[PDB]
Design a protein around this ligand. Structure first.
Ligand code: FAD
Ligand code: SF4
Ligand code: SF4
Ligand code: SF4
Ligand code: SF4
Ligand code: SF4
Ligand code: FES
Lengths: 411, 549, 137
């Protein structure tokens, strides 16, 4: 109700409240915004087929958001780059977009680079504990769970285990055990630490809802005045019920978030030391990147790659026809993106040659971050090279205690 | 209308059959998006798939029929053009029988249009002069692999090679062509699987291999003969397999025993030959990836080492065209009706007659593409070309032009104004993969759905519609098929296999593999499960002597 | 058989002037570094450095004006930030980051230019041939 309130929210409409993963508050808020004409469209995820297929959808008929209700954990896609490419960057039309932590970070990166209009976009953020590739989820269910994947009705990551509901009953396996066996959440999701999107306008989740509402209420955190207005309007027009959250719920929400931070740190560690150190890391990187067939899927899918023509396409950098392409191709992406990589994983998961693009880029990003102190995707802070400052530059030269840029820079 | 609508479709550019989403805004295809649900490619596409959407809405697309009226083509109505075509085809028929006509389709086209095209060519005027690109394209390997096994198709799938120990790429640029088939090689080497490449040149798919082997070009027979000689000599052949499921071993014995030292022919030293031969024969599950005698030698190797009917093994010759397998399956060859039902056998000849309500089917071996083009004035006159550009594709383009101008009433159906179009008398505009609604068939025998994204540009129509309207003009019964589903159901009634591949089953993202004889059958991703498809049910392995050119 | 390949990218207004002054004063140093001469060091893009290192520069040197003495008021702050980030990238791709340095040489420091030349040559000689030249193959 005011920019910081933590609430329990569920839909007045019983059908919306049934089809919601929790209380249907994301689908009641989106429906209200559409039908009261705050927004001209709504960009949400719906199942196109079996629940393993997540299809983004622009919806203008308020009658079609009941189809968007429910959370697809196999939806590993990224929304904001689609709004720039096929919705003209939301420069003329207001939208309301449901987004995960990576989708909120991408919104802010593209708004920094002036590619979308966050004055027009409303971001309803969802908590995210991780996403699974659809085909990997299928193999998981066929092998480890011993079930025919077409039998599954619903499937969710709850309490750190992979619950599936099929005909016959339900099952559960620890996601950590699956991830050791070679399955589970995506690699970047294991390394992710953007669990509650507090940079969005509303943050909805199933964490901190305790007691009589454990499966029929959504924990709402109001993160901005725009979200406060949307929530107050929905509550007054009577599309959404609001009760103040339970302090014990708030506490255990904080504890689960903190534990997820620690797990993300552990995976960051084990992955980045798994890549190697010294000339071994150069042979890993160079031998992996020698596979690239120049499909440019990584460039076209990256949120930070907004350039009309990539420098990887310029003949004075990359020879046009030489297919065993140079390491310069990936050096040009390390130089341009690694300062602000939101670890969305799209580059890694769309690569036909299975190159660990996201692992390399995030390994560079984490310590560009601990060097310059710039966290990508949180707010309108300009990129590090788009805003250089006199005093800060003096400061980093003096901190080296040296007359040049040569040594005493790293530990 | 619609803003950013996703439509799932198959890529039309090679035989992998990757799935992709076309983004359609206000009835215009505005981009290609990943489809992460697909088993074939998990949302991953090569440059061709990424930019497949560019050619759809080009201004150069044919929009209305054209008629050559004493010179440059003038704009015609559908009724006018079709009545002209029907009249001219009718007269050429009535003067020169079924030998006088000639049909050839492309492998770019959907299965329903290939099937209705061959049905048009046979149900009406009974001619088997029907054919497609696969002849002039790289591989007549289908005949050789058919002789070896029984089915010229690839024995296993693409995901299947993840189960081997010894992927053996042989003379293949699997990452230049079929990059998402070569993705399996990348995944396998990441899993730590022995990979041996044998191309004549150090290609980007030979980079992925643990061992790379040069040989002098045009020496596959000699190299494979040497490898089989060493396998036989040290006795790493598979005795149960050879004694149970294979025939011809003595012939192979004689033929290969003259290739102990073939360094003269192929450049490979005897040490490297023994290395690859023994690694292959010792591997428990080894898969060969190939890209006539050349493919039968591969069949010889697989049969000799017993590497055929099982997970993680087999022979996978890569096709190269998006629906070449589908066209051959539908029966756009001179000798096969559909599902490789030979026309030489009166049994299914009479079955075709009864099913199609037509009598006296030809039964003679038709004329292939080059056969037709060479006899294009002598006895063939009148030709329908469904999507070909022969003047640009065949060698001796000037000879092709001479033969085509020697021809009475060429009819050409295309989406673009090609070079072959100038020699046409009628030009019927067509639809591309974004306006059709049929199926493709991958090189791994998988039937994938093609979905309609937009409408054909102007007055252009899709091929099932054109051929049905032409057959209704000419008075042919059996072409009352208003949809790709009805065409598919007619084909399924005709063919023994593919009877289980209903569209309600093809709407699954997984698709269906071709030997699917019943409606509850899940498909046959691995062929020759425990018996082959020849007369005794046993593979025959042949003895090929190397012919120096 | 091996001679270090060091490439320098020196601004026109202080580092080129300093090198010229060293030459005029006849300060000797080994002939291992070859220079490019851009207007400011703000011109130096990261892709220049990375292109040099991937073509096989055993070392790269970027020399410019002291902080507060850029001819164009603040163009070497941008270069300094860029080179700090380049140092980080080379360390994380596993190439030795001491193959790269950025020195601030004024227009009157011909002696310091000579000393920079000597020290860069010595450091690259200690480091040895770059690994990219064999990792490519
Ligand atoms: C992959 C994934 C993982 C999640 N993990 C957690 C977790 O660990 N803990 C937790 O507390 N919450 C998690 N959530 C959020 C959880 O589902 C929320 O409790 C829920 O969204 C509350 O909303 P609701 O039920 O009230 O409304 P709903 O009716 O469920 O609305 C859900 C909204 O999310 C949209 N959506 C569905 N799938 C996606 C997707 N893949 N990407 C983007 N938007 C999508 C739908 O279109 C809809 O608008 C996750 C969500 C997703 C998509
Ligand atoms: S990257 Fe982070 S926010 Fe995005 S889906 Fe994975 S875990 Fe959730
Ligand atoms: S997605 Fe992979 S294969 Fe394609 S250009 Fe990027 S790194 Fe290369
Ligand atoms: S480089 Fe890859 S992981 Fe990083 S932001 Fe871009 S797409 Fe996401
Ligand atoms: S890699 Fe650099 S040049 Fe290329 S699109 Fe991304 S930001 Fe632009
Ligand atoms: S691999 Fe073949 S089918 Fe797949 S996108 Fe590339 S060209 Fe198309
Ligand atoms: S003028 Fe030399 S650094 Fe700018």
């Amino acid at each position: 109700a005011a920019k910081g309130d933590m609430l329990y929210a569920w839909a007045k409409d019983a059908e919306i409240q049934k089809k919601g993963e929790c209380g249907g508050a994301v689908t009641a808020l989106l429906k209200h915004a559409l039908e009261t004409k705050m927004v001209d469209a709504v960009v949400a995820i719906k199942k196109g087929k079996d629940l393993y297929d997540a299809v983004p959808t622009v919806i203008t008929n308020p009658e079609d958001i009941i189809q968007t209700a429910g959370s697809l954990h196999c939806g590993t896609l990224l929304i904001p780059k689609l709004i720039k490419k096929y919705l003209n960057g939301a420069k003329d039309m207001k939208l309301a977009v449901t987004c995960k932590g990576c989708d909120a970070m991408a919104f802010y990166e593209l708004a920094k680079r002036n590619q979308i209009n966050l004055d027009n976009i409303i971001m309803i953020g969802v908590n995210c504990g991780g996403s699974v590739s659809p085909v990997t989820a299928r193999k998981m269910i066929s092998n480890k769970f011993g079930v025919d994947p077409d039998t599954v009705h619903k499937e969710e990551i709850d309490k750190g285990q992979f619950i599936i509901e099929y005909e016959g009953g339900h099952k559960g396996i620890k996601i950590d055990e699956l991830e050791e066996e070679g399955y589970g959440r995506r690699s970047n999701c294991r390394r992710c630490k953007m669990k509650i999107p507090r940079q969005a306008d509303i943050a909805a989740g199933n964490w901190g809802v305790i007691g009589d509402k454990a499966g029929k209420a959504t924990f709402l955190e109001i993160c901005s005045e725009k979200g406060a207005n949307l929530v107050n309007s929905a509550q007054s027009k009577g599309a959404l019920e609001i009760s103040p959250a339970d302090p014990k719920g708030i506490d255990i929400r904080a504890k689960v978030e903190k534990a997820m931070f620690n797990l993300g740190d552990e995976w960051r560690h084990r992955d980045f030391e798994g890549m190697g150190k010294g000339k071994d890391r150069l042979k890993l990187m160079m031998s992996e990147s020698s596979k690239c067939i120049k499909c440019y899927a990584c460039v076209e899918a990256c949120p930070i790659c907004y350039c009309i023509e990539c420098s990887t396409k310029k003949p004075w950098y990359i020879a046009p026809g030489v297919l065993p392409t140079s390491f310069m191709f990936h050096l040009i992406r390390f130089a341009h993106v690694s300062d602000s990589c939101i670890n969305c994983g799209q580059c890694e998961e769309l690569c036909p040659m299975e190159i660990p693009n996201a692992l390399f880029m995030h390994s560079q990003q984490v310590e560009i971050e601990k060097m310059f102190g710039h966290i990508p995707g949180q707010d309108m802070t300009p990129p590090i090279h788009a805003f250089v400052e006199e005093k800060a530059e003096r400061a980093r030269l003096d901190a080296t205690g040296t007359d040049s840029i040569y040594t005493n820079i790293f530990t | 209308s619609e803003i950013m609508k996703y439509v799932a479709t198959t890529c039309p550019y090679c035989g992998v059959g990757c799935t992709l989403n076309l983004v359609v805004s206000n009835g215009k295809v505005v981009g290609v998006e990943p489809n992460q649900r697909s088993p074939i490619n998990e949302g991953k596409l090569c440059p061709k798939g990424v930019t497949c959407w560019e050619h759809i809405h080009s201004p150069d697309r044919l929009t209305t029929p054209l008629i050559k009226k004493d010179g440059k083509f003038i704009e015609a109505s559908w009724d006018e053009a079709l009545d002209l075509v029907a009249k001219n085809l009718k007269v050429i028929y009535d003067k020169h029988g079924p030998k006088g006509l000639g049909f050839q389709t492309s492998c770019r086209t959907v299965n329903e249009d290939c099937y209705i095209f061959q049905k048009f060519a046979r149900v009406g005027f009974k001619t088997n002069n029907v054919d497609n690109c696969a002849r002039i394209c790289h591989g007549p390997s289908v005949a050789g692999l058919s002789l070896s096994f029984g089915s010229g198709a690839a024995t296993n799938g693409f995901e299947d090679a993840l189960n081997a120990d010894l992927i053996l790429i042989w003379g293949s640029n699997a990452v230049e062509a079929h990059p998402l088939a070569g993705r399996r090689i990348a995944q396998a080497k990441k899993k730590g699987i022995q990979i041996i490449a044998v191309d004549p040149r150090y290609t980007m798919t030979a980079r992925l291999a643990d061992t790379y082997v040069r040989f002098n070009p045009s020496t596959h027979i000699a190299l494979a003969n040497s490898m089989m000689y060493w396998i036989i000599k040290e006795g790493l052949e598979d005795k149960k397999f050879i004694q149970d499921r294979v025939n011809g071993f003595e012939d192979l014995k004689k033929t290969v025993e003259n290739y102990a030292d073939a360094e003269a022919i192929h450049g490979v030293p005897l040490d490297v030959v023994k290395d690859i031969a023994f690694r292959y024969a010792k591997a428990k599950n080894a898969v060969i990836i190939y890209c006539t005698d050349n493919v039968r030698s591969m069949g010889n190797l697989a049969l000799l080492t017993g590497n055929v009917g099982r997970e993680g093994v087999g022979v996978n010759p890569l096709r190269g065209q998006n629906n070449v397998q589908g066209a051959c399956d539908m029966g756009a060859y001179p000798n096969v009706y559909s599902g490789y039902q030979k026309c030489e056998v009166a049994e299914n000849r009479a079955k075709m007659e009864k099913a199609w309500s037509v009598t006296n089917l030809p039964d003679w071996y038709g004329a292939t593409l080059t056969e037709q083009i060479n006899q294009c004035g002598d006895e063939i006159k009148g030709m329908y070309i469904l999507g070909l550009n022969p003047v640009v594709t065949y060698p001796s383009s000037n000879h092709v032009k001479a033969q085509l101008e020697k021809l009475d009433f060429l009819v050409v159906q295309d989406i673009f104004f090609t070079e072959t179009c100038q020699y046409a008398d009628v030009i019927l505009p067509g639809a591309c993969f974004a306006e059709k609604d049929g199926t493709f068939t991958s090189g791994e025998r998988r039937i994938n759905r093609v979905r309609k994204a937009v409408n054909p540009p102007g007055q252009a129509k899709e091929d099932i519609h054109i051929i049905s309207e032409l057959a209704a003009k000419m008075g042919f019964k059996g072409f009352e098929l208003p949809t790709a589903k009805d065409v598919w159901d007619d084909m399924r009634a005709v063919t023994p296999s593919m009877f289980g591949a209903t569209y309600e089953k093809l709407e699954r993202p997984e698709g269906i593999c071709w030997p699917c004889p019943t409606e509850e059958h899940p498909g046959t991703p691995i062929l020759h499960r425990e018996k082959f498809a020849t007369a005794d049910g046993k593979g025959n392995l042949f003895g090929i002597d190397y012919r120096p050119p | 058989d091996w001679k270090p390949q060091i490439l320098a990218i020196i601004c026109n207004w202080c580092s080129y002037a300093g090198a010229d002054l060293a030459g005029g004063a006849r300060i000797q140093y080994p002939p291992t570094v070859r220079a490019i001469r851009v207007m400011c060091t703000g011109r130096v893009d990261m892709l220049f450095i990375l292109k040099a290192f991937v073509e096989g520069a055993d070392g790269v040197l970027v020399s410019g004006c002291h902080f507060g003495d850029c001819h164009y008021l603040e163009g070497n702050y941008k270069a300094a930030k860029r080179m700090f980030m380049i140092k980080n990238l080379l360390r994380n791709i596993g190439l030795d980051d001491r193959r790269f340095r950025m020195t601030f040489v004024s227009a009157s420091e011909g002696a310091k230019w000579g000393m920079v030349m000597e020290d860069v040559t010595n450091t690259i000689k200690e480091l040895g041939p770059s690994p990219i030249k064999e990792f490519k193959k």
